[PDB]
């Protein structure tokens, strides 16, 4: 059978502003013979565990995966890593209804909006492992938190993008400080 999958992680983040650096690292067991890292939209690959990008470009954004080989056996491929280039478009607006300071137990709706031409939004809360996407396809979208708790408090930023290039996102909105008491 295949060897167990390696991990594939981006640091400092998978949401990389244009011209900022990022490392993609494939991590399998120590001492494996060969690594293969590949971008899902490329017809080529690299036979190294690390891809360092000194300055993020639109062409580098996309889905990536990696594998390793040990004693002739290839591993299962890693979970897909989505590398996003941010700062590609003007930032959207981000607001909270009824407001950013709210009591625990009720709802709070984080809302984003951009000009017509962008149909998707994603919310990123500082410190979270990943952004929150939204099934909405419209120039504005709502992200209701049905029951807010103190755990939902934090700094949120919203991004807008188009279904035509789902890995090219806008500059983040101004931050919203959600304070749940």
């Amino acid at each position, epitope marked *: 059978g295949p060897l167990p999958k390696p991990s594939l992680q981006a640091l400092p983040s998978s949401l990389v502003p244009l011209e900022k650096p990022v490392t993609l690292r494939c991590q399998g067991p120590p001492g494996v013979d060969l690594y293969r890292l590949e971008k899902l939209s490329s017809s080529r690959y690299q036979d190294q565990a690390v891809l360092f990008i000194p300055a993020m470009k639109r062409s580098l954004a996309g889905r990536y995966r990696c594998s390793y080989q040990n004693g002739s056996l290839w591993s299962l491929p890693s979970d897909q890593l989505e590398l996003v280039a941010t700062g590609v478009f003007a930032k959207p607006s981000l607001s909270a209804q009824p407001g950013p300071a709210v009591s625990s137990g*009720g709802d709070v709706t984080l809302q984003c909006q951009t000009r017509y031409g962008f149909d998707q939004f994603a919310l990123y809360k500082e410190g979270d*492992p990943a952004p*929150y996407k939204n099934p*909405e396809r419209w120039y504005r979208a709502s992200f209701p938190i*049905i029951t807010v708790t103190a755990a939902h408090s934090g700094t949120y930023r919203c991004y807008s993008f188009s279904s035509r290039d789902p890995y090219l996102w806008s500059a983040p909105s101004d931050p919203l400080e959600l304070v749940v008491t």
Partner: antibody, heavy 120, light 113 residues
Framework: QVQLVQSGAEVKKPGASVKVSCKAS????????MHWVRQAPGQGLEWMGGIYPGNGDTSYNQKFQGRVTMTRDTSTSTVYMELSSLRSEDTAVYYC?????????????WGQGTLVTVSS | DIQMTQSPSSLSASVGDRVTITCRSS???????????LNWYQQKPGKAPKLLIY???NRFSGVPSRFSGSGSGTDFTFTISSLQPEDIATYYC?????????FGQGTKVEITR
């Protein structure tokens, strides 16, 4: 490949308990709350409660308060539901279903269900 | 608790017919912030339920356009504009506006042929 894989069917005596597992894969585990919904044979759906995997906070339907415990193991992306003092009325298929922490498009991915028969 | 009353409890319709299902809540589903969380699920036999509509009228990703939802307050509707043979299922409304979350008793949909 978003998936919720549950443990196999169970048979338990009245008065005993059952513990069902729900292993998640293909997504960021702490981005979705995990709820449990049950269905008695030939009947409708009933909401039991949910857990937030990030910190283990729970919120149960008062009808099960004191007899249901939901827990999670972050390292294996698994959520457990334990229901105690089982009676005939607890014979049901028990499903786990994910609910986005931010958003309201709840229960977009469900587990395959686990039949629990309560009988001596 | 909020009680969701679904009607009819079952129906049979021919391929291409318009099917309308109603769900009535015992009390208002407009919360203190003016919002309503009401979703519709489709459960085919031997399978888990599937999310079709969320937030009263939003089709979830990949859901065919024949499925729609509408309503406000205590009165909600789910519509199949042109019934297909593969649409045979029990459909359920769910209110996520007040805890405990409660489902309608379901509408079983069958085909007349």
């Amino acid at each position: 490949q978003v998936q919720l894989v549950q443990s196999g069917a169970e048979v338990k005596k009245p008065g005993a308990s059952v513990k069902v597992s729900c292993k998640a894969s293909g997504y960021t585990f702490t981005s979705y709350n995990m709820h449990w919904v049950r269905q008695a044979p030939g009947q409708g759906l009933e909401w039991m409660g949910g857990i937030y995997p990030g910190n283990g906070d729970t919120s149960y339907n008062q009808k099960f308060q004191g007899r249901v415990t939901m827990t999670r193991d972050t390292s294996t992306s698994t959520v457990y539901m334990e229901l105690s003092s089982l009676r005939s009325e607890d014979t049901a298929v028990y499903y786990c279903a994910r609910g986005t922490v931010v958003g309201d498009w709840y229960f977009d991915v469900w587990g395959q269900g686990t039949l629990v028969t309560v009988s001596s | 608790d909020i009680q969701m009353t679904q009607s009819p409890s079952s129906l049979s319709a021919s391929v291409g017919d318009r099917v309308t299902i109603t769900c009535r809540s015992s009390q208002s589903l407009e919360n203190s912030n003016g919002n309503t969380y009401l979703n519709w699920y489709q459960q085919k036999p031997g399978k888990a339920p599937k999310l079709l509509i969320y937030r009263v009228s939003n089709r979830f990703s990949g859901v065919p356009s024949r499925f729609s939802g509408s309503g406000s307050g205590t009165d909600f509707t789910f519509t199949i504009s042109s019934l297909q043979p593969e649409d045979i299922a029990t459909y359920y409304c769910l209110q996520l506006t007040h805890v405990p979350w409660t489902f309608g008793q379901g509408t079983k949909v069958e085909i007349t042929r």
